[PDB]
Design an enzyme around this catalytic site. Structure first.
Site, PDB file in Angstrom:
ATOM      1  N   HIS A 179      -7.324  -3.336  13.594  1.00 42.13           N
ATOM      2  CA  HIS A 179      -8.112  -4.482  14.022  1.00 42.13           C
ATOM      3  C   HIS A 179      -7.323  -5.754  13.783  1.00 42.13           C
ATOM      4  O   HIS A 179      -7.029  -6.086  12.623  1.00 42.13           O
ATOM      5  CB  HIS A 179      -9.421  -4.520  13.234  1.00 42.13           C
ATOM      6  CG  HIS A 179     -10.343  -3.413  13.620  1.00 42.13           C
ATOM      7  ND1 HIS A 179     -11.398  -3.022  12.827  1.00 42.13           N
ATOM      8  CD2 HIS A 179     -10.362  -2.602  14.699  1.00 42.13           C
ATOM      9  CE1 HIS A 179     -12.018  -2.013  13.398  1.00 42.13           C
ATOM     10  NE2 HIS A 179     -11.417  -1.748  14.545  1.00 42.13           N
ATOM     11  N   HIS A 233      -6.049  -5.508   9.800  1.00 42.74           N
ATOM     12  CA  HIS A 233      -6.259  -4.435   8.842  1.00 42.74           C
ATOM     13  C   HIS A 233      -6.529  -3.172   9.634  1.00 42.74           C
ATOM     14  O   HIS A 233      -6.664  -3.197  10.858  1.00 42.74           O
ATOM     15  CB  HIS A 233      -7.449  -4.711   7.919  1.00 42.74           C
ATOM     16  CG  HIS A 233      -8.719  -4.895   8.676  1.00 42.74           C
ATOM     17  ND1 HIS A 233      -9.073  -6.097   9.238  1.00 42.74           N
ATOM     18  CD2 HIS A 233      -9.671  -4.010   9.046  1.00 42.74           C
ATOM     19  CE1 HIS A 233     -10.211  -5.964   9.888  1.00 42.74           C
ATOM     20  NE2 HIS A 233     -10.588  -4.706   9.781  1.00 42.74           N
ATOM     21  N   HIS A 242      -8.531   0.952   9.554  1.00 42.95           N
ATOM     22  CA  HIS A 242      -9.475   1.942   9.052  1.00 42.95           C
ATOM     23  C   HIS A 242      -8.853   3.305   9.299  1.00 42.95           C
ATOM     24  O   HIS A 242      -8.215   3.499  10.330  1.00 42.95           O
ATOM     25  CB  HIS A 242     -10.787   1.852   9.773  1.00 42.95           C
ATOM     26  CG  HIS A 242     -11.401   0.486   9.732  1.00 42.95           C
ATOM     27  ND1 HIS A 242     -12.398   0.143   8.845  1.00 42.95           N
ATOM     28  CD2 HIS A 242     -11.142  -0.628  10.456  1.00 42.95           C
ATOM     29  CE1 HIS A 242     -12.764  -1.111   9.048  1.00 42.95           C
ATOM     30  NE2 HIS A 242     -11.995  -1.606   9.999  1.00 42.95           N
ATOM     31  N   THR A 272     -17.604  -4.672  11.519  1.00 41.00           N
ATOM     32  CA  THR A 272     -17.922  -3.294  11.166  1.00 41.00           C
ATOM     33  C   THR A 272     -18.064  -3.097   9.673  1.00 41.00           C
ATOM     34  O   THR A 272     -18.291  -1.953   9.234  1.00 41.00           O
ATOM     35  CB  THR A 272     -16.870  -2.314  11.698  1.00 41.00           C
ATOM     36  OG1 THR A 272     -15.616  -2.541  11.025  1.00 41.00           O
ATOM     37  CG2 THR A 272     -16.728  -2.434  13.217  1.00 41.00           C
ATOM     38  N   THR A 273     -17.947  -4.158   8.887  1.00 40.48           N
ATOM     39  CA  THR A 273     -18.219  -4.141   7.461  1.00 40.48           C
ATOM     40  C   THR A 273     -19.237  -5.216   7.136  1.00 40.48           C
ATOM     41  O   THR A 273     -19.344  -6.223   7.848  1.00 40.48           O
ATOM     42  CB  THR A 273     -16.948  -4.425   6.644  1.00 40.48           C
ATOM     43  OG1 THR A 273     -16.384  -5.670   7.064  1.00 40.48           O
ATOM     44  CG2 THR A 273     -15.910  -3.323   6.839  1.00 40.48           C
ATOM     45  N   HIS A 332     -11.483  -2.364   0.030  1.00 35.33           N
ATOM     46  CA  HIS A 332     -12.034  -1.675   1.196  1.00 35.33           C
ATOM     47  C   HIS A 332     -10.939  -1.253   2.163  1.00 35.33           C
ATOM     48  O   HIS A 332     -11.015  -0.172   2.756  1.00 35.33           O
ATOM     49  CB  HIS A 332     -13.035  -2.587   1.941  1.00 35.33           C
ATOM     50  CG  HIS A 332     -13.992  -3.298   1.027  1.00 35.33           C
ATOM     51  ND1 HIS A 332     -14.993  -2.633   0.345  1.00 35.33           N
ATOM     52  CD2 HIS A 332     -14.124  -4.608   0.713  1.00 35.33           C
ATOM     53  CE1 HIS A 332     -15.685  -3.505  -0.376  1.00 35.33           C
ATOM     54  NE2 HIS A 332     -15.186  -4.711  -0.164  1.00 35.33           N
ATOM     55  N   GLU A 380     -13.015   3.911  13.977  1.00 34.94           N
ATOM     56  CA  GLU A 380     -14.378   3.429  14.043  1.00 34.94           C
ATOM     57  C   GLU A 380     -14.942   3.580  15.449  1.00 34.94           C
ATOM     58  O   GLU A 380     -15.931   4.277  15.662  1.00 34.94           O
ATOM     59  CB  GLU A 380     -14.394   1.972  13.609  1.00 34.94           C
ATOM     60  CG  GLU A 380     -13.921   1.836  12.168  1.00 34.94           C
ATOM     61  CD  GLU A 380     -14.471   0.643  11.469  1.00 34.94           C
ATOM     62  OE1 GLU A 380     -14.272  -0.506  11.943  1.00 34.94           O
ATOM     63  OE2 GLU A 380     -15.125   0.839  10.414  1.00 34.94           O
TER      64      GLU A 380
HETATM   65  C1  LIG Z   1     -16.957 -12.427   6.963  1.00 29.05           C
HETATM   66  C2  LIG Z   1     -15.744 -12.533   6.057  1.00 29.05           C
HETATM   67  C3  LIG Z   1     -15.285 -11.174   5.540  1.00 29.05           C
HETATM   68  N1  LIG Z   1     -15.086 -10.191   6.587  1.00 29.05           N
HETATM   69  C4  LIG Z   1     -14.183 -10.349   7.562  1.00 29.05           C
HETATM   70  O1  LIG Z   1     -13.486 -11.341   7.668  1.00 29.05           O
HETATM   71  C5  LIG Z   1     -14.079  -9.247   8.573  1.00 29.05           C
HETATM   72  C6  LIG Z   1     -13.264  -9.363   9.687  1.00 29.05           C
HETATM   73  C7  LIG Z   1     -13.165  -8.346  10.616  1.00 29.05           C
HETATM   74  C8  LIG Z   1     -13.880  -7.183  10.415  1.00 29.05           C
HETATM   75  S1  LIG Z   1     -13.741  -5.895  11.626  1.00 29.05           S
HETATM   76  N2  LIG Z   1     -13.557  -4.503  10.754  1.00 29.05           N
HETATM   77  O2  LIG Z   1     -14.981  -5.810  12.343  1.00 29.05           O
HETATM   78  O3  LIG Z   1     -12.558  -6.172  12.402  1.00 29.05           O
HETATM   79  C9  LIG Z   1     -14.710  -7.045   9.305  1.00 29.05           C
HETATM   80  C10 LIG Z   1     -14.793  -8.065   8.379  1.00 29.05           C
HETATM   81  C11 LIG Z   1     -16.021 -13.415   4.837  1.00 29.05           C
HETATM   82  N3  LIG Z   1     -16.110 -14.828   5.130  1.00 29.05           N
HETATM   83  C12 LIG Z   1     -17.273 -15.522   5.351  1.00 29.05           C
HETATM   84  C13 LIG Z   1     -16.998 -16.835   5.597  1.00 29.05           C
HETATM   85  C14 LIG Z   1     -15.580 -16.977   5.520  1.00 29.05           C
HETATM   86  C15 LIG Z   1     -14.690 -18.052   5.663  1.00 29.05           C
HETATM   87  C16 LIG Z   1     -13.336 -17.832   5.525  1.00 29.05           C
HETATM   88  C17 LIG Z   1     -12.840 -16.547   5.234  1.00 29.05           C
HETATM   89  C18 LIG Z   1     -13.691 -15.467   5.077  1.00 29.05           C
HETATM   90  C19 LIG Z   1     -15.060 -15.695   5.221  1.00 29.05           C
HETATM   91 ZN   LIG Z   2     -11.979  -3.551  10.916  1.00 29.38          ZN
END
Ligand SMILES: C[C@H](CNC(=O)c1ccc(S(N)(=O)=O)cc1)Cn1ccc2ccccc21
Ligand SMILES: [Zn+2]
EC number: 4.2.1.1
Length: 258
Positions: free
Chosen positions: A117, A92, A94, A196-197, A62, A104
């Site tokens: 981000h 990361h 976008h 946002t994902t 992604h 975004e």
């Molecule tokens: C949600 C997580 C996967 N997603 C993210 O970490 C994440 C972070 C920031 C954004 S943004 N674009 O809004 O900044 C989007 C996605 C999975 N996950 C679930 C539990 C968990 C525990 C440890 C590591 C990963 C884990």
């Molecule tokens: Zn992001």
């Protein structure tokens, strides 16, 4: 077939597996600079990255994530709208297929070429997976990128991208200093929102810097040579990995500056 950014699995489809996509505090949003209100009580941001310990860079299909050691309070975000301390876990970006799109968040409907981000989690919840289940679990520092002069502090990232071209590839990425990605000013807007994902969890205090950073056309061009696909599969360029602005609903965006 698994979420993504294409016509058949992109943002308009996500709600079928992640109903919170239509929730009350979704991100990103448009920042209307004529409606956001200066909040005198907002404290200066405290970005403490001197002890940051980067580890690895990963193409996750992604985007690409630069990951940090968050086993102790090494790189933290405090202050601003936040109470307590939030540890940097990864950053990361976008970005778009063209310089006129990619961010975004938008500012008065303006789209930037890309958006950085820096993702932090609230240490009072002990670990990241617990934090994402809490309304105040994450703080994401968002930084707009515009195309202009090169950003020297980004070049180390750009030059490793050839080694993580496809989904699932990773490379060592130690000794990277995220302070080189910040603009001069820490003036910001802030609002409560979401990832946002997928899973789109409503766990984020958003802090979006007003000053964009400038990157060169050559730098962002190299972002656009990444692949969404894995090795040996048909090549799908990693571009336009952004979610569009979502309804603000019952939320106020606050400005740290007059
Ligand atoms: C949600 C997580 C996967 N997603 C993210 O970490 C994440 C972070 C920031 C954004 S943004 N674009 O809004 O900044 C989007 C996605 C999975 N996950 C679930 C539990 C968990 C525990 C440890 C590591 C990963 C884990
Ligand atoms: Zn992001």
């Amino acid at each position: 077939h698994h979420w993504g950014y294409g016509k058949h699995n992109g943002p308009e489809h996500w709600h079928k597996d992640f109903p919170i996509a239509k929730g009350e505090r979704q991100s990103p949003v448009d920042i209307d600079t004529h409606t956001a209100k200066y909040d005198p009580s907002l404290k200066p941001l405290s970005v403490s990255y001197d002890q940051a310990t980067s580890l690895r860079i990963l193409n996750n299909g992604h985007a690409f994530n630069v990951e940090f050691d968050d086993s102790q309070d090494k790189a933290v975000l405090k202050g601003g709208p936040l109470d307590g301390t939030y540890r940097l876990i990864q950053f990361h970006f976008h970005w778009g297929s063209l310089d006129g799109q990619g961010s975004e968040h938008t500012v008065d409907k303006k789209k930037y070429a890309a958006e950085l981000h820096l993702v932090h989690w609230n240490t009072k919840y002990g670990d990241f997976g617990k934090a994402v289940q809490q309304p105040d679990g994450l703080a994401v520092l968002g930084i707009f990128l515009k195309v202009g002069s090169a950003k020297p502090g980004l070049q180390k990232v750009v030059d490793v991208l050839d080694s993580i071209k496809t989904k699932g590839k990773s490379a060592d990425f130690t000794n990277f200093d995220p302070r080189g990605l910040l603009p001069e000013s820490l003036d910001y807007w802030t609002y409560p929102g979401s990832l946002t994902t997928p899973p789109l969890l409503e766990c984020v205090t958003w802090i979006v810097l007003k000053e964009p950073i400038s990157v060169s056309s050559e730098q962002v061009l190299k972002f656009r040579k990444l692949n969404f696909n894995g090795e040996g599969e048909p090549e799908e360029l990693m571009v336009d990995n952004w979610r569009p602005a979502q309804p603000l609903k019952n939320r106020q965006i606050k400005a740290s500056f007059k």
